[PDB]
């Protein structure tokens, strides 16, 4: 089984524009949204069909109550941060927690916070400590690390509960998450050689150019892996052609355990 991950995000805005939610929470399995909640709807709803069909209404009712409490806690924490920063206006507070189940069977776990889109506090579940970026975060670090039981709780949830939730969701949407659609790869000229792939899933793909069997990463332009809108993805990579000398250029694409080579005549 390939590498998979489960993550939950939280967004808090202090003085939002009218109509924009004060609080938003979204969960993901890989790049797939699975759950959503905001301060406007005040309801936790599935964002994937295989989540809605495998979780009874009692699951969504329970976490609706929890998110309503977590929404208020996020509001109190953001109010504390902005007061200690002596900042006026609207500012953002973000949270990210999750885990990965790698291909070899090993696991990772992470939990971190952000203020105005920049790292604020980062949790280390091995040393059981919080990394603070400034003195406002240093104050929060002191209060959180005085609650040793909460640090141990976060270590257990990241290493045990998160991985267990991930395996559960992986089985729910195995027809989506564990399928493989190979890419359609082509090469055209535009002077640079553009190697383009599309129609592939999972989105993880490695595209590069080789000049006479040697990879020169400095002169390769890499395009982003973009969603096509139908569940598949597309990407590209270009390299500049030497007008003074001919060379043996070949595009190399690796996707889901299969390697591809497109030699340019």
């Amino acid at each position: 089984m390939r590498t998979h991950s489960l993550r939950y995000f939280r967004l808090g805005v202090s003085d939002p524009i009218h109509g924009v939610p004060e609080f938003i929470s979204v969960g993901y399995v890989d790049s797939h949204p699975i759950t959503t909640y905001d301060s406007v709807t005040r309801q936790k709803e599935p964002r994937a069909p295989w989540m809605a069909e495998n979780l009874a209404p009692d699951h969504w009712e329970r976490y609706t109550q929890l998110l309503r409490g977590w929404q208020q806690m996020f509001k109190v924490e953001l109010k504390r941060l902005q007061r200690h920063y002596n900042h006026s206006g609207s500012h953002t507070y973000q949270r990210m927690i999750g885990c990965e189940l790698l291909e070899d069977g090993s696991t990772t776990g992470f939990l971190q916070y952000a203020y105005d889109g920049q790292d604020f506090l980062i949790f280390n579940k091995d040393t059981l400590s919080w990394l603070a970026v400034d003195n406002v975060a240093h104050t929060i670090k002191q209060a959180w690390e005085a609650n040793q039981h909460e640090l141990l709780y976060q270590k257990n949830w990241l290493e045990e509960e998160c991985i267990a939730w991930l395996k559960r969701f992986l089985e729910y949407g195995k027809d989506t998450l564990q399928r493989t659609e190979p890419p359609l790869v082509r090469v055209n000229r535009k002077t640079a050689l553009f190697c383009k792939a599309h129609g592939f899933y999972p989105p993880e793909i490695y595209m590069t150019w080789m000049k006479n069997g040697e990879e020169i990463v400095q002169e390769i332009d890499y395009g982003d892996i973009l969603p096509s809108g139908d569940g598949t993805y597309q990407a590209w990579a270009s390299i500049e052609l030497d007008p003074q000398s001919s060379n043996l250029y070949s595009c190399h694409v690796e996707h889901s355990g299969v390697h591809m080579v497109l030699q340019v005549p």
Partner: antibody
Amino acid sequence: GQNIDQPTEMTATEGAIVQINCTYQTSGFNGLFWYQQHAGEAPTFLSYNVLDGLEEKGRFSSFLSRSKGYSYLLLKELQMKDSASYLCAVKDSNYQLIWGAGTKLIIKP
Amino acid sequence: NAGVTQTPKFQVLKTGQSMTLQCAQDMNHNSMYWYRQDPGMGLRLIYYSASEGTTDKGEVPNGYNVSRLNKREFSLRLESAAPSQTSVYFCASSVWTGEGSGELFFGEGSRLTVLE
């Protein structure tokens, strides 16, 4: 589907040691709590375990084994005031408490 | 600093009689709960309030209703008392809910006897 089990009653002698067991079968695990409740009074928090090992707090110590799904509350140098019911509770995957029926500790002076 | 204050300590009720149990906490907590304790079984949640402005049913909501009147107060309502509701009712509170290591703070308890 979720079950908590602890003995109904235990009797020990003053000054001795007693070990109150709590086994649990739950869908997920977010921690095990121990509470003390004297007769006719409110339960009060005693200890919390979420990782494996033994934590000490005065004469009381609490142990946890996640793989075996079992915990014990250890009371050393028993006194008459230790006579109470001791409740064990576990938070499941959805952070809901599942309560054991409680163990009544009787101390012989 | 009184903690959790619930009333009344005792109450006799006739079948069909209405009753309201009060509960207040001065610890600036967000989560409040209502339990019933019966012989031979563990505490069973009736209703809970994860935060101010929201409530939801517990394990045994039938025959009861609650109201999170404000951040401090969480009342339990028996509209038509039944003999099966003879129990000791405990109201509790915690700083937050879904926090993991956060413990509960219980009130003194309310003993109820419903008689035909």
